[PDB]
């Protein structure tokens, strides 16, 4: 059995529908797979010691 | 529109256009705040009018959802909502250019010969379509009500 | 647009050369009056004979309203 | 297939065809020495 | 797309096939279909074959109805092309035109 | 009904002659046979 | 245009001789083709509509190409595309009844290239369409008269491409 | 008239008369009023208007009155008036029937052949029509000389 | 063709006088009612095609010339029935919206009663169904606008007859 | 041909959505300048005559071309150019009118460099003549509208080159 | 009717007849006992093709005896079953005639027009005709009927 | 150009979607007929000048073409028509391989009959030369090798047509 | 494709096919099967490479979808998501045709300037894509992922 009471409440706007190359598809997926973003990392330039703290090898 | 209705004519005449049609043009020109205001409220109840006007002609006519029917099937139900829209937005189309020509040269020629393909019945288009005219008359003032029509009566009368 | 009801019979002066098929060259037609000079003087050029004409389309004298 | 059979028939026997019909036609000598 | 007032003006015969092809190409739609999507000359050329059912023949054929088209439009074009020696000699009154 | 395939079936193939020398050439084939 | 028996009367005219050995095979295959021909056409022609129903339903429809943006989008455009799938249909049974394709090299592919790039049609969902005809045509008539007819239509697709 | 020109267009696309072009009729018959309050002053003043543009065509043409010009005598320049006369009635004809089209079908094609069998000067009538143009103007208000401007320049651009 | 502005514009030019009050009236009666004519065109064009179908079945519908041997009987023969009743309409239509009958007696009735005499359609049956269309729009679109179609359509009727 | 209302009406619908206000701004814009482009037009068409007479008294007189050896030397020639000029100037004020430069590519522009490559008319000397027609219909109607003219005759000129 | 359109493309042509389209008349000759054998089988089984494609065709869709529908009580249903029987006559003249000309001369053609102006579904005209074809396959050998449903399947694709 | 599989690559491409069943069968199918192209293409290379030679004996020595007033009279228009010849082979045998003719378009006939049409060359005598090479083709190389290549040089005759 | 390649360098050089060409051809007919099951795994679990090495991508690179960084925000990197699907689509694509040629043309040409304007890492690209290849490696046959692998292999040469 198919109704179509659902399908016309369900009707949206085919400009308003999702192509192949359009970013907002993959929307969901990246609400699935939450990114971990990181704590900033509070930093001074001004306690930082130019000729020391450079890399020597 | 009626501009390019009269460029087309006295370009096929081979003649500037006379006064007698740029008071027209003119005319045309300083009442187009009624025409926009008209397409500013369908574009804004563009959706409402669809799904009412979809809702009372698969409950006038339920053979059209009926087994063995043109739109028997939810996709094809929503191909059917998409035509009204589509349909709807040549209404508006025509509304915010005071003329039949964007309906004509967009969504008329070759409707008769493209549904008797697809099998759809052309008089229930020309349902859908009066449906949307009355749902679009009743949700707006008397006057625009009857401007809007006017081109949905003209788009039923080429349906049928 | 104001017109003529003319009958005509204009018989071919090349078909004999060109050896093409045949129409029947007596007619009744309708011809609009812009149209009707060089109508018919194309008839009278080609031999045809004019047997019929009327006004059939507008009335006579007609000053203004004429297309 | 019957105009092919009919044709397959003519094409075997054409030089016969041509050389009776030169042989009724032309005298004074034989009209098939030179047949190309 | 159709003109029926035309075609049952055809089917009764108060004009005949002549005027029918006049008519239909001084149209609204022959207007839309090949003198809207062209210049002038190349409406001509084309204008030609859908009347006389050939193309044009010399450069003061092409002259001429170019300067007849650059007078009267498209109405006046397709009157000089069907009130000539050639369309009543080829096609006549009746005869549909066709490609030669 | 598989003899439907005339086109989409097996191409059969012509016998199709190179071309002579003609009677254009008249002049130098009595030429060549006096060459010999 | 010229058919196959044409084609044989012209080459062996140019040869000068009759027909002597293969000619005669290639009238008779011909001949014993012609009347499953004649009813495949009496097929096609019966039911002319429903192929390229099934054929724009199989390939064209719910595409980009239907969609706004799309070649089919305009029902003037729609009617037009109907019309040539119709037109590469009855040339096709032309040809196949004709048993050569002078018929596609003169009324269609003499300008069907040209006029496609000015318009702007889509080759390739062009391409696609006539595939879609030749398989419906080859479910709707048969195996042997579908490849009779698909030899035709994918000449006409390789005239596409 | 515009309404037979509508009517024109309608029945050469072979179908009824627009929305757009209905409501351009609309607009038509609501100036109506303004165009016949144009045409009650203009054939009020339809003696010292002609009057006052003889006398400046007169004046600026003396040629036309002098020996060698086409006007000479009393006969002849009251004939001059005529014309004038007919042309200014014309115009309010015009005025009238919203377009130029009466004075087209009356006596603006054909004029010059008309003035080259007379052996009239065509710039010289273009020149006195000018003035009758400049002298109603003058005695016009300001929209009434821009709605009857339109009119007396399209005669002026086919009678040139 | 001759609306009521360029008609009353001739008579004043053969006497080649100035629109004077005389004529003016009715161009005043005209002005006023314009947009009625506007609005009844509207509504006619808006219900064009059940004013059709509601005149046939009242009037032309189980009669005899919808039966076999009658002059309505085929097919085509009912199509060409049903557009001369609304190229009628049509033309009533443009007559209305004119303010005269010129365009009526004349593109219409210019050969109308020779053809219908020498085709055998029945003239008092094409009359019944005029009278059916004038009472339909007359009960559809009012009184006055309804007997302004119905002065326009009995002059129809009077062509004819 | 496309004037402004739909040209923004395509734009729409290729896209395939409705009407927003970054769409409706340019329908009250061509609102706003269509009283100015009636009025120039009417301007224009008054004075169409004149505009090419002091535009080739100001361009082509007493020029090279003009005189014995010139490309319009004959009166032929001169009238062709004159028929010319008045088909820029209307074609022109046709795309002033409409506000959208279709109809100067769709049917003045698209072959006519060929044309004129086929006829040996110096384009440059018929842009200078376009150029002059813009100084003097610059001069006759204002700035406001006459910028608005040259850029047509630009169009036109730029697609003659 | 096929030497109808000999004669038409002859004349259009302009010549005689060629031997090929003379065989074509023997052919045509030759099967006329066919075709009338199969005309009056059909003829003699008229009736059962018009109920039993009716009483399929009212429980196949039921939306036009239903009320919103066309057939309602007796009267409606009379004619329809008339119309049936009319497009069986007319299928039995093309099939007598050995080609569609006379179903285009006295129905084929305006039917859509007739049946919109009428309110009548064109699809179930078409689909109407489908049972008259395949209850007329079943009672005649479809070998035979072969010939019946090569004129039946062109009157369905032109009601389609 | 392209080849079938880069064509089924762009069309996906364009679609925006992945490679779905019909487009692995069309890969499918050209993966079968490889074997077969490759064959062919060995054997065209093995006879690549002798094909030319047999077909040009086969259709145009010996006649009004390379007779004097003959476009190959000369030395040179014989070097030329037999550069024709073998271009049109290299080209025809690349699309063989391609399974595609778009380099035809894109290499051969591209602008090819304008470039015959201002030098003179008649086509006619190109296209029995080409259905010459069609002919001595098809005896060498097969009977499907031989459709396909009949095809492609099919397609070069109605370019050159 | 590398058909599409050797009739291109067979062009440039004016001969017909090398025998060693026509066996790389061979060749690739013979094994295309193998790449056809490749890709149709490859569109099957077109998702899961996606995902994980999405997942791994912001592990390793967690300065990706920091704030400040190119993909930081929840559209930002649904189009990181998008441009991974993209460039598995044209891993199949390369797989298909048995040449690069096609990746390069797609998205391998331009692609530094494109990332460049956008501001995006083009070695973090890469490392998606190395990702993407690690996973897909995981998916598939030794065999299969190591002629697989090498289609990554020359996407990341050209972006890193
Ligand atoms: C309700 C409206 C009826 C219904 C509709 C229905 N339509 C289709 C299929 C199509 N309709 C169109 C039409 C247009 N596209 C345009 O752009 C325009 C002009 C603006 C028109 C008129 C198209 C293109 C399709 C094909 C879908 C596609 O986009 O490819 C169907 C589906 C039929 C099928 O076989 O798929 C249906 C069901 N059917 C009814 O019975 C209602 C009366
Ligand atoms: C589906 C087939 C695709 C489609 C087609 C499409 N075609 C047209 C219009 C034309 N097609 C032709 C071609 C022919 N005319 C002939 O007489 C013959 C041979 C018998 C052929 C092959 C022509 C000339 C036109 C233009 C005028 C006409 O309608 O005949 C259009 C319309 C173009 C427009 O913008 O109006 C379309 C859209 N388009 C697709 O996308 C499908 C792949
Ligand atoms: C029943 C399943 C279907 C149906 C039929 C239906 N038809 C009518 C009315 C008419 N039909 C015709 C048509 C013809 N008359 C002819 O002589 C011919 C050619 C031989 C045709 C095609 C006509 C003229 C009428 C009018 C009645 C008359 O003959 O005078 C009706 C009645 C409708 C009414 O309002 O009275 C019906 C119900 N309707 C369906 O829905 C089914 C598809
Ligand atoms: C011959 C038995 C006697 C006769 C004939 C005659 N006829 C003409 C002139 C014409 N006759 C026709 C005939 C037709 N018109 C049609 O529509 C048809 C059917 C297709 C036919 C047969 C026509 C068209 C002409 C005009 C010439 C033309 O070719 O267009 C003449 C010539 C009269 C003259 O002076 O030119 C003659 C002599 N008269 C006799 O004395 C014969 C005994
Ligand atoms: C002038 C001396 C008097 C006169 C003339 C007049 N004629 C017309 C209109 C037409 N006259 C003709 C007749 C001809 N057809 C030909 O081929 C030839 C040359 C042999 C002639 C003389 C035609 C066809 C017309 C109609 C014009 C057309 O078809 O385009 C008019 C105009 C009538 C009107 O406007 O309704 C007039 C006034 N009448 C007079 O009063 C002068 C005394
Ligand atoms: C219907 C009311 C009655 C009917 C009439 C009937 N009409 C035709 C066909 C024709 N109708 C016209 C009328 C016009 N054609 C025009 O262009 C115009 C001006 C707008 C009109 C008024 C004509 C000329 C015809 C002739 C042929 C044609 O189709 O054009 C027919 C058919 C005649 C035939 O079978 O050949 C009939 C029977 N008959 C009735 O019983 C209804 C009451
Ligand atoms: C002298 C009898 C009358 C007259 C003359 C006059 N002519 C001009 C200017 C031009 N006349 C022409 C015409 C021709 N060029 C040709 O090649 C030929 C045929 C061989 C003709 C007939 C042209 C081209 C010009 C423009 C000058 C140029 O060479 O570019 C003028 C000057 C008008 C101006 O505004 O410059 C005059 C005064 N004037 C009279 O009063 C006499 C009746
Ligand atoms: C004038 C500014 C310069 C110039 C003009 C010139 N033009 C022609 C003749 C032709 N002009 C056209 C152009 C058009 N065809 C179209 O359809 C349209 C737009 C709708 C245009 C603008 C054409 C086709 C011709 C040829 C027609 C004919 O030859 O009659 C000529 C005559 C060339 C000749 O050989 O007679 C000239 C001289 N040349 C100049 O030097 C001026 C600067
Ligand atoms: C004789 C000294 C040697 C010889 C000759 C030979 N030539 C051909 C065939 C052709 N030769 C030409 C060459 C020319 N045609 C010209 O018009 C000119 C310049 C005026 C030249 C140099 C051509 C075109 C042909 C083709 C025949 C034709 O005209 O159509 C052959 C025949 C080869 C064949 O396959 O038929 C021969 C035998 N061969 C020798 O060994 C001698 C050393
Ligand atoms: C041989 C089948 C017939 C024929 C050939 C012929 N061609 C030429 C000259 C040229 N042909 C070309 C064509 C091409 N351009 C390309 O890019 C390609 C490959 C894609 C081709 C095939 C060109 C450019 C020329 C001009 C070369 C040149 O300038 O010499 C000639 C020479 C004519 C001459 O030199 O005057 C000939 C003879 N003509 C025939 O009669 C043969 C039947």
Known sequence: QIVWQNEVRRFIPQEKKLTAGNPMNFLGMARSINPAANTIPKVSAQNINIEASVPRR | ?160 | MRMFRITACVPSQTRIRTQRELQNTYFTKLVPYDNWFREQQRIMKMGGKIVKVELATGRPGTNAGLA | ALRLEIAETLTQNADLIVSRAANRIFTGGSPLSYLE | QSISYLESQVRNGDISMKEFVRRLAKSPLYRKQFFEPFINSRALELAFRHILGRGPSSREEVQKYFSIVSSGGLPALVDALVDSQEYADYFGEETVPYLR | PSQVAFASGDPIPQNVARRTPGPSLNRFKEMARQVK | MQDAITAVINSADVQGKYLDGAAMDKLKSYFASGELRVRAASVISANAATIVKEAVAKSLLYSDVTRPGGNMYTTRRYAACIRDLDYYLRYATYAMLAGDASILDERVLNGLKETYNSLGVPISSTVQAIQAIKEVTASLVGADAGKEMGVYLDYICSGLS
């Open chain 2, 1 to 160: 529109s009626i501009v390019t209705k009269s460029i087309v004519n006295a370009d096929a005449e081979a003649r500037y256009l006379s006064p007698g049609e740029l008071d027209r043009i003119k005319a045309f020109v300083t009442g187009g705040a009624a025409r926009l205001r008209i397409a500013e409220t369908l574009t804004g109840s563009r959706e409402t009018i669809v799904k009412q006007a979809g809702d009372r002609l698969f409950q006038k006519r339920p053979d059209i959802v009926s087994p063995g029917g043109n739109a028997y099937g939810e996709e094809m139900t929503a191909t059917c909502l998409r035509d009204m829209d589509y349909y709807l937005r040549l209404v508006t189309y025509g509304v915010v250019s005071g003329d039949v020509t964007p309906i004509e040269e967009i969504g008329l020629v070759g409707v008769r010969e493209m549904y008797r393909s697809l099998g759809t019945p052309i008089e229930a288009v020309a349902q859908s379509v009066r449906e949307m005219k009355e749902v679009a008359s009743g949700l707006m003032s008397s006057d625009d009500a009857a401007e809007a029509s006017a081109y949905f009566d003209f788009v039923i009368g080429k349906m049928s």
